[PDB]
Symmetry: D2
């Protein structure tokens, strides 16, 4: 968790979050995804072809991840397997089409990280210019 910052540094940290979040939402909206869905698909790529238990996905990223995964399952992007010896546990793995989607997203996401860094630096420079010029 975030320990005490001055109010001004704390508002700047939130502005950093808000700017980054908005740029990701705009790029992920084009693929009908959220960043949490991208983060699930990336996590499943790190163990592909093996699956991961729904609870372990939530722990590495909980009840909102089942609806999230339902959307990914309906799109054929992930495959669910109920553990035959423990029917409450659902393991989820990436499919070929989830791998393809992540390969198609590599360039848009890298550009999205470049736009984040650019806008963050401009926002910070606007505040720096303001502080230098009130002094």
């Amino acid at each position: 968790r975030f320990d005490s910052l001055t109010q001004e540094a704390y508002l700047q940290l939130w502005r950093t979050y808000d700017r980054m979040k908005a740029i990701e939402e705009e790029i992920f909206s084009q693929f009908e995804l959220s960043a949490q869905q991208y983060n699930t698909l990336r996590l499943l790529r790190s163990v592909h072809p093996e699956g991961m238990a729904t609870l372990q996905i939530a722990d590495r990223l909980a009840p909102d991840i089942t609806r999230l995964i339902d959307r990914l399952d309906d799109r054929g992007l992930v495959l669910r397997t109920r553990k035959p010896e423990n029917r409450r546990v659902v393991e989820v793995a990436l499919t070929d089409a989830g791998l393809k989607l992540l390969k198609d997203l590599e360039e848009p996401v890298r550009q999205c990280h470049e736009r984040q860094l650019g806008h963050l630096a401009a926002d910070e420079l606007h505040e720096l210019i303001r502080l230098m010029e009130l002094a």
Copy 2:
């Protein structure tokens, strides 16, 4: 709380926090303060000459704020008043020397916010240059 970011945006948000936190710690260390002590003194200035209940200070910023305030009381920077009708409640107000300390800190803190913004923008530009040049 901070909703899902990509891992990369999440690490950048933590780098923003770490950089800002370190610059404040270095300037506040010179006055033998923490940022949470500065934040308490600023909060008490907004109601000066009135005091604020220890619980309301914690709520606006809890058991760690009493040791924090003890240090400020020992330095003569704040004045405690136990409520005569409710002895468990301790109201804390700024003193003249706490007001003076905040006036002496206005310039160092503004420079500290300028150094934060500068370093944040450079750190972000280093990552942007790296991403543009791997592509």
Copy 3:
């Protein structure tokens, strides 16, 4: 021409030039061009399919532009036409292959301008951090 700057602003202006120049040289070297050759080809595109007199090219950008254009002519990127009534005058126009080369250069050059702006802003922020921290 550049009127009086402080020595420090003058050295910074030269650092701006040196950084921009080096990034262009590296991208144009890959197509076996110089920036002055790119600038000639762009100038000839603005009047294509008409040609421009060698002297007017030099004026809009003089004896070093004939060797420069010789290289472009040998590569089939420009076409020379000696004026039949005035044999000293050589009009130069872009060819289809010079147009194609400029279309292939649009993306690399835009990225080159993005890397220039990025590096310029980082170099300036390094000097700003240095000045704020000597004070």
Copy 4:
């Protein structure tokens, strides 16, 4: 002199000059100076208590430097000495009041260089954001 840049890099170099020049003009106007007068006073400080020939001042920075120096002489900031053996040569040295003026200008000029660097980096980041977002 500045060798071939792309048109876009050349306009950016001029924007760098224009921004830096305007910030200096605004700070130097407050002391009723130009940057060329500041540059003369700094040059005379490097040889103080010795003077420098008017022609050597012009060479290190020519007929416009005599009016420039006249203003500095009228303000008691420099002292002229006509060479007794060569009456055409006028050596100019800093006075105590020219040294004092340069000591009073150290902080405003350093802040002026910080505002230049800040504004340059913001201007460049605005253009970088624009280029990344047209792509």
